[PDB]
Amino acid sequence: SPIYDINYYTSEPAQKI
């Protein structure tokens, strides 16, 4: 269920993206 929170890969490159 907490798979939706696995998008932290995006939450990391806050500066990159």
Q: How far apart are CA 15 and CA 17, in angstroms?
A: 5
Which tokens sit at 9? Answer: 């890969």
- Which contiguous run of DSSP H or E holds residue 11? helix 8-11
Alpha carbons within 13 A on the beta-carbon side of 12:
5
Please, what sign has the CA dihedral across residues 17, 9, 14, 16?
negative
Residue 6 contacts residue 13 (beta carbons within 8 Å) = no
CA dist 15 → 1, 5, 10 (Å)? 28, 19, 10
Name the experiment that determined this structure: NMR
